Symmetry: D2
Subunit: 272 residues, 4 copies
Amino acid sequence: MKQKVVSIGDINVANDLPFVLFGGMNVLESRDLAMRICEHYVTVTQKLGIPYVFKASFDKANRSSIHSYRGPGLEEGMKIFQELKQTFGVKIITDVHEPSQAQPVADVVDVIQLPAFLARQTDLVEAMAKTGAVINVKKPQFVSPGQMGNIVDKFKEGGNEKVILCDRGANFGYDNLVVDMLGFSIMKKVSGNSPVIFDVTHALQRAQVAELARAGMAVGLAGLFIEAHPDPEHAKCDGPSALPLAKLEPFLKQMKAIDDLVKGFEELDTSK
Amino acid sequence: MKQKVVSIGDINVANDLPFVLFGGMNVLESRDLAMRICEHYVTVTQKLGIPYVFKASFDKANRSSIHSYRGPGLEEGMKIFQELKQTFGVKIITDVHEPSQAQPVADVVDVIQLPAFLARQTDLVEAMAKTGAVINVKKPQFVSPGQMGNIVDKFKEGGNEKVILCDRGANFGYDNLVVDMLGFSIMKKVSGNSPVIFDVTHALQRAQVAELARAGMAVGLAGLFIEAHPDPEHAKCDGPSALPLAKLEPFLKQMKAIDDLVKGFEELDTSK
Amino acid sequence: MKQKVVSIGDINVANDLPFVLFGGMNVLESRDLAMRICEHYVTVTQKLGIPYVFKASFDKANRSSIHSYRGPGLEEGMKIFQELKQTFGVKIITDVHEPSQAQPVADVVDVIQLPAFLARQTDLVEAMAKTGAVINVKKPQFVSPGQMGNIVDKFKEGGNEKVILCDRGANFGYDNLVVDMLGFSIMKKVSGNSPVIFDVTHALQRAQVAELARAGMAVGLAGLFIEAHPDPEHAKCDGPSALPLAKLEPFLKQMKAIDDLVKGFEELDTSK
Amino acid sequence: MKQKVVSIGDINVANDLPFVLFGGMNVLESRDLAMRICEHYVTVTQKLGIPYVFKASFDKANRSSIHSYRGPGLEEGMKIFQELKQTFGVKIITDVHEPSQAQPVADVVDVIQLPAFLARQTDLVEAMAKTGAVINVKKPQFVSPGQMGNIVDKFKEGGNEKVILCDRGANFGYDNLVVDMLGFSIMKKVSGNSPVIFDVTHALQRAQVAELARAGMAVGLAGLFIEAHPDPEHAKCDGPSALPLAKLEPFLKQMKAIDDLVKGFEELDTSK
């Protein structure tokens, strides 16, 4: 059984190929920081040899209050991305919330994301479908893996047939997530063997970011979705949990020994 | 400790008062059926003495496919409700999905609902806030009760301070819900003692609809949210699970013996 | 469909009959307290009309340390029970851990219990089977209701065909229990409609002891298993959570209005 | 922080050392099969370089019926082990159920196991404590990792201070397990950094046996606990899920590239 391929340009996201790191940042604060975030990623990638797609949000349709920081704004948010793109030669990936945003962002970025809590929003799915530009489907914590097949279909149907599946863990009682390492496999099956990627930071809501990320990779995934910030201690707000940037290389070095060393195994069948 | 009160007209939704049945139907098919659905509710209510607010959706922003039945449409959906209202003298409650819909529907209905998967959608919350018209907040299966406090605040903040909390159960492993009877109490606390109501049908995704609904009521809730269809066997599609309409009275008779007989207890403190 | 009946003497435990309160205490400290515990139960029961079976353990094969208080001991533990029995005219129920204990205790008590974590211990089950004296099977938190059928069979097989099923909740993530009100029904089915009873205190590991117990009863159960201590604040150690004794009557008064008022309903079928 | 060491002879079980494979079989049928089971393990181990301890049960205190196959018996079960030991030069590990068995088996084997459902059985723990012979503590599916500390203490207290911790997954709703890759770390902490090993087969109740086992190893564990049978299709009864023996080498080859390649990493601190 061969794997699907959803190339976002000169990049090839697949299950049997080397993992594609969709590294980046959470919210889109300012440039001096953003482009700085790219600086280390961009560097370590080439330096260690790893496909890379920066990631940043230009809006937070949700937080812990109304009089909060929305974000750069749909408009001012796209201007942001533009720059860095030409400044480094890498693709950008950002999540959309309202149907509209879809098309406008479909022209600036190379990978559009779909918010987990919106995973099953037809109006939007059918909407985001038009673009036909690579889509990453975040997997809700309250949805069984095998249910992923239908979400991939409702998309193909609308038009777009280039999708990715992102796992961020499952609900384990109240206020807790746990990653079913066995979801990935179950997730390939029903998804016409689409590319499956593990979102560690936003599976950890920590000196765990590592150990966890190791186990995911040793399963054989299309790639990783990660987030890092210069000082993970101060801007230590809520939502996901980010990596202590500086630790990019030593960490990503680990993944490579996994991704690579595992992506090259004589297919095993413990079935029979 | 006294309970909050969020009267939706001549009706008073509270925790220590008799339960308010927010009975109704799921999707808004056609009138001959809708108004028929009201016919039995409307009757049994007065006949047995029970506050009543019909409920029906004029859209399904999500299902199992794109080339599916959206619904009457935001526009044609409001026309629908109008009629029945004057035809029976009862209030209508319907869920909104996009900010816009909010205000338009705020003039036709008496109780606006907020979709569970949208529970934490600020743009919308802040939006639906303007109306200031009674709001029912469906409680996501993946959200801990105590987290309900913030969602109630972000609303008060925007303006609206008349909210209701609806429990539809919690995620129990993959593809399964379970209702934490203890959520309700925990749910009153953090919610300035707002009105708490149990959504049974959409806690059961059955000859269980009953037994389950009995246990909820015996806890002391503001009221029930239910759905019934003439023939629960054929149009037996997916989403929630509806009641075999005809069984409205015998069932609602049960709730009354609970709601009433329990709403009238000398407050007990097993605390000390 | 008629219910099973497992009379433990002049008492009749069943699903359609009034609930049988298996009230009592946790560990067997001393008599002045024990017989005192019975004093209020014994009284309130007759005073309010409720079947009663005292309950107390004569050993704790497990706690939080070795140099801990085992208990009166298998031997000295039986002497204890004897007295109170003749002193009040009520039956005693106690849990056994090692095959041996079974028979010895089978002559003193009227209801023998089976520890949850031992639920699937054949050697013991086959052992406790001989006695043929009423058995109460505690339901492990990690076992699905429908699995209860086999445990009831392995017992019938050995000999004993008079069993009871006790629910203490299910595991909800780490360190947390939740009671599936729907387990009871599922639990009757596979159990040849054996008597099902809800263990509230040891479903709560609190001013919740009440609200929770109300919802269980409104389902239609054979009865309750409860535990109370004079001062729930000091001897506030770990294991289950006990009731503030003094609150027996006001509480048990609640259950009666449930048990009774619900045990007398015209069977409803929301099925069709 | 250095790891603990619980050598079971010329073998050293630890967290930073190469993983120790506690491979073997489930029940102890007959020799021609048992010693055959050892044959391939024993071979592949030396051939690939891997610490090895055979494992087999001489009794099943639980199954799906009384008139079932107990096992060789405590007595005849020990005779069994003896032989193979001298026949191959490897250590044996078997689970005990009743206090007695402890000491008798403490003289024949090199690693005694403690049944999960008995994990918190003081009488036995205090009992098995005397021997002072290496102990492996199976971790119940219904027990939070951090709770492991006390079980390790109650043992040290009794005497024995040479323990191992085995993870078999956690309960995920009804009838389902999921392995919290993050338990291991949490499990080292509270356990004075005792050796932690992952039980895959009996975490899977399958072509998954592999992928799952890969992720565990990439975390950094003391070792693996596995079970294999010649024909996993016929004797395909219930309990755990075994490996298709023949697939030992290709599989264990995978683990080595993990265990080794990961056990040799410059300690990383994503903490800060």
